Amino acid sequence: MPLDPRVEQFLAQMLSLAEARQQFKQGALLLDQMVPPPPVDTEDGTVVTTHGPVRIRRYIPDRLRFSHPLVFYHGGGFVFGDIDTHHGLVARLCQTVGATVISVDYSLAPEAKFPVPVAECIDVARWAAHEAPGWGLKPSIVVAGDSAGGNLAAVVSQRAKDESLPIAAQLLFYPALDMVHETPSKRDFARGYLLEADAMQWFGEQYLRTPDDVSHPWASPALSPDLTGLPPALVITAEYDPLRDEGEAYAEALRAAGVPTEQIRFDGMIHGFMTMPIFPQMEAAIEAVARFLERID
Numbered sequence: 001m002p003l004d005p006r007v008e009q010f011l012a013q014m015l016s017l018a019e020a021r022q023q024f025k026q027g028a029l030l031l032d033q034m035v036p037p038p039p040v041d042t043e044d045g046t047v048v049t050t051h052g053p054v055r056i057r058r059y060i061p062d063r064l065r066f067s068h069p070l071v072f073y074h075g076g077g078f079v080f081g082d083i084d085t086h087h088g089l090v091a092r093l094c095q096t097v098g099a100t101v102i103s104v105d106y107s108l109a110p111e112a113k114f115p116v117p118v119a120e121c122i123d124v125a126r127w128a129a130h131e132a133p134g135w136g137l138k139p140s141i142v143v144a145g146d147s148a149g150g151n152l153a154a155v156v157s158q159r160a161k162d163e164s165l166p167i168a169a170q171l172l173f174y175p176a177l178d179m180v181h182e183t184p185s186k187r188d189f190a191r192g193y194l195l196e197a198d199a200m201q202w203f204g205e206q207y208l209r210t211p212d213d214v215s216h217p218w219a220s221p222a223l224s225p226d227l228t229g230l231p232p233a234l235v236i237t238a239e240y241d242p243l244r245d246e247g248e249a250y251a252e253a254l255r256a257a258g259v260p261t262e263q264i265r266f267d268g269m270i271h272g273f274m275t276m277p278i279f280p281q282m283e284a285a286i287e288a289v290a291r292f293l294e295r296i297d
């Protein structure tokens with residue numbers, strides 16, 4: 001299906017680690033300047049994890065309408081991003097769903113290596129489940145994330161039973177799920193669609209300890225042979241995203257494992273579109289989240 005016109009225009013108009021991080025943040029700030037986020041009440045805090053303090057920001061909706069806390073893990077290849085880069089998305093999730101959202105500043109690579117952020121993300125989810133009753137909410141949490149953050153959400157979801165972590169649903173926004181296998185989309189959309197082959201490779205070099213880690217299920221959750229009993233899943237993909245096919249294949253595997261699953265491909269879109277508020281499809285996908293979550297209770 002053709003590229004979306006606004007996406008086409010965006011692509012046509014186009015250092016040290018610290019500098020690369022700053023450049024990523026500058027770009028996110030620019031898009032938020034173009035399309036300002038909704039006002040939203042927030043409170044910063046710090047969770048004690050097994051790998052150290054992890055900063056969080058709790059988002060409080062104007063009107064609470066959803067009975068589970070969301071815990072959101074930002075993307076950025078495990079190397080980039082923070083609560084501020086993903087505020088545009090999280091503010092909208094909060095206000096549109098009417099949900100309290102916990103946005104997590106997990107430790108970045110290469111300073112922290114796999115599987116440190118997985119452990120931290122479990123610890124924060126557990127914290128949220130324990131706090132939920134004092135917020136007037138159910139203890140079972142909804143985990144969410146984009147790209148690398150969708151990887152984290154998916155892995156947390158696979159570990160949840162074993163970690164005694166109650167999870168009501170998982171929201172995976174164009175996740176990375178299989179670091180072993182090449183898919184057609186990974187071959188065909190490797191260059192020129194924002195998320196590129198060279199970058200994916202480099203992110204893996206920063207995050208993983210050794211090349212063998214690609215086959216670990218906590219790195220590549222799509223390799224897990226038993227998906228039965230996992231949390232209800234919303235899997236959103238973009239048509240022209242190298243990660244599309246692994247996302248869609250995981251959704252099919254969940255569906256066939258009896259997991260209530262909604263799989264939505266946004267046609268004409270690219271990786272990253274749910275943190276790019278220049279595209280109306282970002283809000284459409286947030287509405288999809290709200291509609292999905294209406295069905296959880």
Ligand SMILES: O=C(O)c1ccccc1C(=O)O
Binds near residue numbers: 024080081272
């Ligand atoms: O994880 C990713 O794909 C990613 C990679 C580089 C920058 C940003 C992102 C993001 O999702 O926010």
Ligand SMILES: O=C(O)c1ccccc1C(=O)O
Binds near residue numbers: 176179205
């Ligand atoms: O296999 C991948 O795509 C991938 C692998 C390692 C780190 C990050 C990613 C990512 O795109 O965010």
